[PDB]
Amino acid sequence: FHASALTRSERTELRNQRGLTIWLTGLSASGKSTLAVELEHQLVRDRRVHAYRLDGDNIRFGLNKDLGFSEADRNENIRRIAEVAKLFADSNSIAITSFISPYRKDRDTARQLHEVATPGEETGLPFVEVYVDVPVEVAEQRDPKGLYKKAREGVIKEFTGISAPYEAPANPEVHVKNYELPVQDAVKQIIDYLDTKGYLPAK
Amino acid sequence: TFHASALTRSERTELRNQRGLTIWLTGLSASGKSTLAVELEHQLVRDRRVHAYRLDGDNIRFGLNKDLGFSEADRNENIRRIAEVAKLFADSNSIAITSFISPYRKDRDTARQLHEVTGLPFVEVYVDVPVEVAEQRDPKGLYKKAREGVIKEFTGISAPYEAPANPEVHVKNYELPVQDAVKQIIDYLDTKGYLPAKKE
Numbered sequence: 391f392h393a394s395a396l397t398r399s400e401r402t403e404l405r406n407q408r409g410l411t412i413w414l415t416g417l418s419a420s421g422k423s424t425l426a427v428e429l430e431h432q433l434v435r436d437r438r439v440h441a442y443r444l445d446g447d448n449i450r451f452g453l454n455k456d457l458g459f460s461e462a463d464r465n466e467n468i469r470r471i472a473e474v475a476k477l478f479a480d481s482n483s484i485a486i487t488s489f490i491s492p493y494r495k496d497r498d499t500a501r502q503l504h505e506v507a508t509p510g511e512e513t514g515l516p517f518v519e520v521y522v523d524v525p526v527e528v529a530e531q532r533d534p535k536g537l538y539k540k541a542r543e544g545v546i547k548e549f550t551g552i553s554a555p556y557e558a559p560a561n562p563e564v565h566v567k568n569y570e571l572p573v574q575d576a577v578k579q580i581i582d583y584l585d586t587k588g589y590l591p592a593k
Numbered sequence: 594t595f596h597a598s599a600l601t602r603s604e605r606t607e608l609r610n611q612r613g614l615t616i617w618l619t620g621l622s623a624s625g626k627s628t629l630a631v632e633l634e635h636q637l638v639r640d641r642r643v644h645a646y647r648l649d650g651d652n653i654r655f656g657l658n659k660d661l662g663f664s665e666a667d668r669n670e671n672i673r674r675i676a677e678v679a680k681l682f683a684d685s686n687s688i689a690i691t692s693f694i695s696p697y698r699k700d701r702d703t704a705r706q707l708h709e710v711t712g713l714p715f716v717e718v719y720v721d722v723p724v725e726v727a728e729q730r731d732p733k734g735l736y737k738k739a740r741e742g743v744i745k746e747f748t749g750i751s752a753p754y755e756a757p758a759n760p761e762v763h764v765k766n767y768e769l770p771v772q773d774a775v776k777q778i779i780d781y782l783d784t785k786g787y788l789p790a791k792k793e
């Protein structure tokens with residue numbers, strides 16, 4: 391019987407794909423969730439790989455149902471999400487996250503956790519920071535849930551882009567100017583990048 | 594010309610060619626949980642060709658749960674988080690394999706309902722050895738430290754272990770080859786049709 395756990399190399403070959411994390415960041419209504427859902431469809435369906443999205447829906451009322459909006463809780467929220475994305479990446483799955491993650495330190499913390507060697511290997515796992523970029527005016531014109539309106543009326547306290555800052559990434563792996571660009575083209579810009587790094591199986 | 598709705602379990606199941614579920618190991622320190630987890634993961638990924646992942650002390654205690662100490666509020670939290678992570682894995686159509694002592698019936702029960710509450714299968718595996726067997730293995734000298742009071746509230750010595758009354762799989766993991774134990778688990782999984790067809 392095997393006494394040593396599967397190595398990244400054995401798992402990579404046996405699962406026939408690599409593991410990495412795709413981290414979307416951008417204003418509310420920039421389209422993070424929209425790109426994540428379609429990106430996941432193509433990866434699993436079109437590319438035949440294991441990919442899984444982490445977002446408010448499966449995190450907020452589960453793993454992080456105990457976190458509020460305090461500085462401490464906001465940091466812990468990001469920390470936990472990052473550790474989880476890392477576990478999926480370590481299992482040779484492609485984790486896709488779509489949290490506003492407004493602060494540079496939010497993404498730095500997630501990147502660092504991924505970029506540090508894993509128990510056994512000499513390297514970490516790829517962390518692909520995708521800036522889903524739209525001017526605030528574009529986000530406000532979308533405002534599907536009315537959040538911006540309620541943000542400009544204090545109904546919502548400190549809202550990214552309105553009463554709290556969004557710190558734009560200077561050097562994201564993928565910068566998607568997600569406006570006046572069809573969703574299919576934006577998702578393609580992402581998949582095309584992944585292919586240039588050979589992060590995906592043939593096709 | 595794009596998907597507005599996220600992949601459904603049914604579709605992810607078709608596309609991934611496997612079901613997702615959580616195999617929860619529970620038992621005393623040195624009962625053999627990691628050994629079983631490692632070999633089980635090898636067999637599921639290699640021989641059965643599926644996506645499975647072990648959640649053990651290694652990748653959890655120093656990462657996601659590094660902030661957790663030992664107050665009971667902490668041991669409950671440790672278990673709760675692990676259960677939620679296992680569920681996400683099952684939801685992704687992966688077979689999560691967790692190996693934590695998880696001494697309290699309450700925690701395992703809470704973990705289970707998190708899954709069964711349509712829903713994900715939760716296969717509770719009791720990796721059972723009487724305490725004298727675990728204490729004679731004591732590969733890391735933890736039992737010796739517990740006996741000397743160097744480690745307090747040590748499961749099975751100075752803290753309780755609530756054995757599962759009706760676990761899906763009961764492994765009498767003593768004077769038993771690891772291969773036979775893993776086979777017991779995998780065979781149970783096939784009786785439930787949880788795995789794709791065996792490779793020819």
Ligand SMILES: Nc1ncnc2c1ncn2[C@@H]1O[C@H](COP(=O)(O)OP(=O)(O)O)[C@@H](O)[C@H]1O
Binds near residue numbers: 420421488532570
């Ligand atoms: N490339 C795009 N072109 C036009 N509309 C888009 C595009 N991407 C996203 N949207 C639209 O913008 C709104 C916000 O998208 P959403 O995914 O909910 O954003 P976020 O997850 O960043 O809050 C939705 O109405 C969505 O359909």
Ligand SMILES: Nc1ncnc2c1ncn2[C@@H]1O[C@H](COP(=O)(O)OP(=O)(O)O)[C@@H](O)[C@H]1O
Binds near residue numbers: 768769774
């Ligand atoms: N079936 C077995 N028979 C005899 N020894 C075993 C068996 N399974 C595991 N062990 C031994 O027992 C020790 C504890 O196993 P381990 O898997 O680390 O336990 P646990 O993870 O439950 O604390 C190890 O030294 C291992 O080699």
Ligand SMILES: Nc1ncnc2c1ncn2[C@@H]1O[C@H](COP(=O)(O)OS(=O)(=O)O)[C@@H](O)[C@H]1O
Binds near residue numbers: 650668672692735747
């Ligand atoms: N007080 C303690 N009780 C039990 N295990 C302990 C204790 N202190 C340290 N350990 C170590 O931590 C492992 C148990 O950790 P877990 O499996 O994560 O336990 S659980 O109860 O929270 O599920 C044991 O194998 C042992 O190496």
